[PDB]
Amino acid sequence: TVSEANALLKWKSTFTNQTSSSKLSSWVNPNTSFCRSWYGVSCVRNSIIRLNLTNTDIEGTFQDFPFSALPNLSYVDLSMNRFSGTIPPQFGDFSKLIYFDLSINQLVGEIPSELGKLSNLETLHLVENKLNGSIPSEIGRLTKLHEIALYDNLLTGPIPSSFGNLTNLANLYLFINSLSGPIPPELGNLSSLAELCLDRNKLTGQIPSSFGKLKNVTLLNMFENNLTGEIPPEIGDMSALDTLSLHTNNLTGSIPSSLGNLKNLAILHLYLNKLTGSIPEELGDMETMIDLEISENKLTGPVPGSFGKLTKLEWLFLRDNHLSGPIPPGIANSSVLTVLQLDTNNFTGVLPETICRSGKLEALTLDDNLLSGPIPISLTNCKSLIRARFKGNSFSGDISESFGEYPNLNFIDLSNNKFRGQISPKWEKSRKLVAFIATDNNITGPIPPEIWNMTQLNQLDLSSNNISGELPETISKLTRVSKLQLNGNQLSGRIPSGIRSLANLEYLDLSSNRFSFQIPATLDSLPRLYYMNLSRNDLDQNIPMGLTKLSQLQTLDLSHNNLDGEIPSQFTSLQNLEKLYLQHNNLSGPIPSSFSEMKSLTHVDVSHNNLEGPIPDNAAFKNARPDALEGNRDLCGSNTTQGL
Ligand X SMILES: *[C@@H]1O[C@H](CO)[C@@H](O[C@@H]2O[C@H](CO)[C@@H](O[C@@H]3O[C@H](CO)[C@@H](O)[C@H](O)[C@@H]3O)[C@H](O)[C@H]2NC(C)=O)[C@H](O)[C@H]1NC(C)=O
Ligand Y SMILES: *[C@@H]1O[C@H](CO[C@@H]2O[C@@H](C)[C@@H](O)[C@@H](O)[C@@H]2O)[C@@H](O[C@@H]2O[C@H](CO)[C@@H](O[C@@H]3O[C@H](CO)[C@@H](O)[C@H](O)[C@@H]3O)[C@H](O)[C@H]2NC(C)=O)[C@H](O)[C@H]1NC(C)=O
Ligand Z SMILES: *[C@@H]1O[C@H](CO[C@@H]2O[C@@H](C)[C@@H](O)[C@@H](O)[C@@H]2O)[C@@H](O[C@@H]2O[C@H](CO)[C@@H](O)[C@H](O)[C@H]2NC(C)=O)[C@H](O)[C@H]1NC(C)=O
Ligand U SMILES: *[C@@H]1O[C@H](CO)[C@@H](O[C@@H]2O[C@H](CO)[C@@H](O)[C@H](O)[C@H]2NC(C)=O)[C@H](O)[C@H]1NC(C)=O
Q: Which is nearer to ligand X, 369 or 561 (CB)?
A: 561
- Looking at the chain, the residues that come just before a C–N gap of over 2.5 A are none
**Residues 6 or more apart from 309 whose CB is under 8 A from it?**
284, 285, 287, 330
Q: How many CB atoms lie within 10 A of CB 568?
A: 16
Is there binding between residue 536 and ligand X (CB under 6 A)?
Answer: yes
- The 3-state DSSP composition of the chain as helix, strand, coil percent (nearest 5) reads 20, 25, 60
17, 20, 45, 644: which one contacts ligand U (CB under 6 A)?
Answer: 45
Please state, in angstroms and rounded to a whole number, the distance separating the CA atoms of residues 126 and 616: 70
Is there binding between residue 162 and ligand NAG (CB under 6 A)?
Answer: yes
Give, as ranges, the residues between 200 and 239 that touch ligand U (CB under 6 A): 226
**Phi, psi angles (nearest 5°) of residue 309:** -75, -20
Please state, in angstroms and rounded to a whole number, the distance separating the CA atoms of residues 214 and 587: 80
Judged by beta carbon distances under 5 to 8 A according to partner kind, the member of ligand Z, ligand U, ligand NAG, none in contact with residue 161 is: ligand NAG
Asked whether the beta carbons of 276 and 302 are under 8 A apart, the reply is no
Judged by beta carbon distances under 5 to 8 A according to partner kind, the member of ligand X, ligand Y, ligand Z, none in contact with residue 533 is: ligand X
Closest CA to 93 of 77, 69, 109: 69
Q: How many CB atoms lie within 10 A of CB 622?
A: 11
Is there binding between residue 2 and ligand U (CB under 6 A)?
Answer: no
Give, as ranges, the residues between 29 and 58 that touch ligand NAG (CB under 6 A): none
Is there binding between residue 586 and ligand Z (CB under 6 A)?
Answer: yes
Is there binding between residue 512 and ligand X (CB under 6 A)?
Answer: yes
Q: Which is nearer to ligand Y, 62 or 403 (CB)?
A: 62
Judged by beta carbon distances under 5 to 8 A according to partner kind, the member of ligand Y, ligand NAG, ligand U, none in contact with residue 226 is: ligand U
Q: Which is nearer to ligand X, 273 or 632 (CB)?
A: 632
Is there binding between residue 120 and ligand U (CB under 6 A)?
Answer: no
Q: How many CB atoms lie within 10 A of CB 532?
A: 23
Q: Which is nearer to ligand NAG, 167 or 602 (CB)?
A: 167
Number of residues that bind ligand Y (CB under 6 A): 5
43, 69, 98, 108: which one contacts ligand Y (CB under 6 A)?
Answer: 108
The residue range among 2-10, 39-47, 160-168, 439-447 that interacts with ligand U, by the rule CB under 6 A, is 39-47
Asked whether the beta carbons of 190 and 214 are under 8 A apart, the reply is yes
Is there binding between residue 165 and ligand NAG (CB under 6 A)?
Answer: yes
Is there binding between residue 112 and ligand Z (CB under 6 A)?
Answer: no
Judged by beta carbon distances under 5 to 8 A according to partner kind, the member of ligand Z, ligand X, ligand U, none in contact with residue 586 is: ligand Z
DSSP letter (8 states) at residue 516: B
Asked whether the beta carbons of 346 and 367 are under 8 A apart, the reply is no
Please state, in angstroms and rounded to a whole number, the distance separating the CA atoms of residues 201 and 393: 40
Judged by beta carbon distances under 5 to 8 A according to partner kind, the member of ligand Y, ligand NAG, ligand U, none in contact with residue 16 is: ligand NAG
Is there binding between residue 533 and ligand X (CB under 6 A)?
Answer: yes
Asked whether the beta carbons of 97 and 124 are under 8 A apart, the reply is no
DSSP letter (8 states) at residue 435: E
Judged by beta carbon distances under 5 to 8 A according to partner kind, the member of ligand Y, ligand U, ligand X, none in contact with residue 109 is: ligand Y
Give, as ranges, the residues between 120 and 179 that touch ligand Y (CB under 6 A): 130, 132-133
Asked whether the beta carbons of 197 and 173 are under 8 A apart, the reply is yes
Which residues of the shown chain bind ligand U in the complex (CB under 6 A)? 44-45, 47, 71-72, 226, 250
